[PDB]
């Protein structure tokens, strides 16, 4: 039966769902490579962990190429449509639309990039066709699979928003949320996958599917058009690298805030050498907490899409800046007013945006 | 959001975080096509003017951190996780535990994490000693009355010495690691 830790001589797959891990492992066992397996996995997760990811969203796929030895990122982050505007999430009085409500609006839908990113990946490193790789997920969607406790919970927990769209025909069968044990069948999704299998991503970014999605986003209030989908292209990002304990870390650059701040928190913590303290000591937690407070403050002030704003990446990781931040941390007291620092002092240029508190 | 990773016989390595934002995203499905649509644009700032303000054709700031660690130019570890702004903290913690504390990969992944982005936002997992939480709150921290799971780290280690692979899925979800033999 399925394991949460395994070893292998010829490869390895680790995913949040057994059926997706089985599909990706099947691809490797039959001779395909990690990228082929990853694409297979993404379609499988789209079907079996539907509330978590899919061709309706986007992601960051980092790939180390064993042939060329280079590491790159297929950035499939969604883009706001051309009709989106800076205050689209504010009400008529200038106040933000309550979050839980904001989440269900058409204006919240980004132009999906996942399918485009899988296409790009296969194009660069694939050894199996999208046709071969998507087929096992067409079967899970078409013929179904039994849902566990978790998916059953998500369904009940989100019944209200699901009950408001066509999504209720799949997850809220008659008027009831599918329960653990029930078979989840996704016939329309299987149809879409079969269209992608024969037509390619054009099946998604152009044609009829494009028009229905665009039309639906409009029906729920957003401004997405067919041209927005026609305009979409993923981005190929270079990893941000950092030296750490003798290792080199390749992580995600903006539009993600992840890579910069993972590196910044590690550099900040270096001054305090955590392992001199027991892993569950209050000291270790105290230091992680104070470090997170500084880095998340910097994230909130300086992180954004780099095609649009100047993110002071060199400054946020500059050793003297890191030293300034480490200076603010004390084992024996809490900084009750943690604030972003000034990384611009350690690099050229200035922000082309302001500091605006968010609700 | 979900994170998975794959490594093959040829040296290729994949660390991939992917999402539709909230669970079920907007909740909107393309009628007749079964595709649930993301609500990714709410990751933009609701009040404009800052680095992460909404702009036409701009991408909303993400926290996804698929990462690969190298030792002597060979990939030796992959890490990633779902969790919104907490992703950064889960990935940071797994690296800290596996690298600085030297813990075996699974144990590093399962080590109770904490998360706090401001003086009013704190989270901790079951296992953070209650006496420690009381000492930290005693100093001004605001950890709550109950634990919550944080993140879901899938990770692969690669031992180039023995030419072997090790996969781990976080017990926070029902994930699975499967090694390949032949
Ligand atoms: N939308 C978030 C992820 C949401 C989650 O992981 O729960 C991001 O891109 O960072």
């Amino acid at each position: 039966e399925y394991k949460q830790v395994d070893v292998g001589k010829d490869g390895m797959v680790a995913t949040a769902h057994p059926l997706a891990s089985e599909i990706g492992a099947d691809v490797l066992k039959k001779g395909g490579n990690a990228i082929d397996a990853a694409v297979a996995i993404q379609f499988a997760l789209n079907v079996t962990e539907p509330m978590m990811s899919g061709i309706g969203g986007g992601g960051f796929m980092m790939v180390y190429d064993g042939k060329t030895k280079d590491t790159t990122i297929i950035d499939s982050r969604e883009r706001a449509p051309a009709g989106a505007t800076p205050d689209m999430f504010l009400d008529e009085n200038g106040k933000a639309i309550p979050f839980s409500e904001r989440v269900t609006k058409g204006t919240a839908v980004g132009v999906p990039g996942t399918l485009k990113g899988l296409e790009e990946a296969l194009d660069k490193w694939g050894t199996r066709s999208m046709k071969q790789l998507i087929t096992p997920s067409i079967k899970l969607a078409e013929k179904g699979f039994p849902i566990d406790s978790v998916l059953a919970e998500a369904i009940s927990d989100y019944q209200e928003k699901l009950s408001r769209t066509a999504a209720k025909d799949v997850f809220l069968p008659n008027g009831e949320p599918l329960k653990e044990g029930d078979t989840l069948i996704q016939k329309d999704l299987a149809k879409t996958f079969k269209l992608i299998r024969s037509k390619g991503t054009d099946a998604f970014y152009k044609g009829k599917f494009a028009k229905t999605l665009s039309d639906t986003v409009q029906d729920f209030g957003g401004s997405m058009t067919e041209k927005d989908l026609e305009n979409y292209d993923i981005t190929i990002d270079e990893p941000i690298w950092g030296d750490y304990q003798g290792y080199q870390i390749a992580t995600t650059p903006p539009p993600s805030s992840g890579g910069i701040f993972l590196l910044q928190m590690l550099k900040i913590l270096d001054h305090f050498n955590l392992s001199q303290y027991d892993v569950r000591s209050w000291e270790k937690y105290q230091l992680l907490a104070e470090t997170m407070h500084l880095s998340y403050a910097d994230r909130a002030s300086y992180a954004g899409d780099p095609e649009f704003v100047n993110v002071p990446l060199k400054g946020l990781l500059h050793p003297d800046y890191i030293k300034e931040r480490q200076q603010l941390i004390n084992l024996d007291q809490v900084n009750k007013k943690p604030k972003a620092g000034d990384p611009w002092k350690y690099q050229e240029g200035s922000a082309n945006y302001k500091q605006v508190e968010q609700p | 959001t979900t994170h998975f990773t794959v490594a093959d016989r040829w040296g290729n390595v994949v660390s991939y975080t992917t999402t539709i934002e909230q669970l079920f995203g907007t909740g909107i499905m393309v009628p007749d096509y079964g595709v649930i649509l993301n609500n990714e644009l709410t990751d933009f700032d609701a009040i404009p003017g800052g680095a992460n303000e909404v702009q036409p054709n701009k991408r909303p700031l993400s926290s996804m951190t698929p990462t690969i660690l190298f030792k002597d130019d060979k990939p030796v570890l992959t890490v990633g996780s779902p969790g919104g702004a907490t992703i950064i903290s889960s990935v940071l913690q797994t690296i800290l535990y596996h690298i600085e504390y030297g813990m075996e990969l699974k144990a590093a992944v399962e080590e109770p994490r904490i998360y706090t982005n401001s003086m009013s936002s704190y989270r901790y997992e079951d296992g953070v000693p209650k006496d420690v939480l009381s000492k930290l709150n005693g100093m001004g921290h605001k950890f709550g009355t109950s634990p919550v799971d944080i993140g879901n780290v899938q990770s692969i280690s690669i031992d180039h010495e023995n030419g072997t692979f090790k996969g781990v899925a976080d017990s926070s979800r029902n994930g699975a690691a499967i090694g390949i033999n032949l």
Side-chain angles (χ1 to χ4, degrees), chain A residues 77, chain B residues 1 19 21 40 43 62-64 82-84 87:
Chain A
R77 189 58 164 176
Chain B
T1 304
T19 191
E21 214 304 272
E40 225 70 58
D43 274 1
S62 184
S63 288
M64 292 184 132
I87 294 174

Side-chain angles (χ1 to χ4, degrees), chain A residues 166-196:
Chain A
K168 60 178 166 169
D169 297 338
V170 166
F171 298 101
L172 306 178
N174 295 101
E176 233 64 64
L178 293 159
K179 274 69 189 191
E180 187 169 45
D182 296 1
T183 292
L184 170 61
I185 282 148
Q186 299 172 87
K187 283 295 194 169
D188 292 351
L189 181 65
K191 171 179 67 163
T192 301
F193 278 10
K194 287 179 292 191
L195 277 181
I196 288 164

Side-chain angles (χ1 to χ4, degrees), chain A residues 234-275:
Chain A
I234 47 80
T235 237
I236 302 313
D237 303 353
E238 178 69 25
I240 306 171
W241 290 87
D243 283 324
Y244 171 69
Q245 302 288 185
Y247 295 89
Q248 300 185 297
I249 293 171
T251 189
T252 309
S256 186
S257 65
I260 287 175
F261 295 106
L262 160 66
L263 299 179
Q264 198 188 66
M265 293 189 48
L266 287 177
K267 299 175 173 303
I268 289 170
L269 286 163
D270 177 83
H271 181 249
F272 305 91
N273 200 198
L274 291 183
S275 67

Side-chain angles (χ1 to χ4, degrees), chain A residues 94-108:
Chain A
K95 173 180 169 190
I97 289 180
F99 186 78
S100 64
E101 173 164 47
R102 192 186 320 159
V103 149
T104 71
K105 279 173 192 29
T107 46

Side-chain angles (χ1 to χ4, degrees), chain A residues 138-192:
Chain A
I138 280 168
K139 301 180 192 314
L140 274 39
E142 209 156 54
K143 293 173 85 199
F145 70 91
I147 77 182
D148 50 40
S149 51
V150 177
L151 175 54
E153 300 167 15
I155 294 176
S156 182
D157 281 350
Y158 294 89
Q159 190 184 358
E160 224 265 32
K161 48 189 274 192
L162 291 177
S163 75
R164 319 163 128 177
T165 75
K168 60 178 166 169
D169 297 338
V170 166
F171 298 101
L172 306 178
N174 295 101
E176 233 64 64
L178 293 159
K179 274 69 189 191
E180 187 169 45
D182 296 1
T183 292
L184 170 61
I185 282 148
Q186 299 172 87
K187 283 295 194 169
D188 292 351
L189 181 65
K191 171 179 67 163
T192 301

Side-chain angles (χ1 to χ4, degrees), chain A residues 82-119:
Chain A
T85 55
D87 54 18
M88 59 179 204
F89 294 126
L90 295 182
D91 65 18
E92 48 156 59
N93 168 243
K95 173 180 169 190
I97 289 180
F99 186 78
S100 64
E101 173 164 47
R102 192 186 320 159
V103 149
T104 71
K105 279 173 192 29
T107 46
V109 183
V111 176
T114 292
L115 185 56
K116 263 285 184 169
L118 306 175
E119 168 173 68

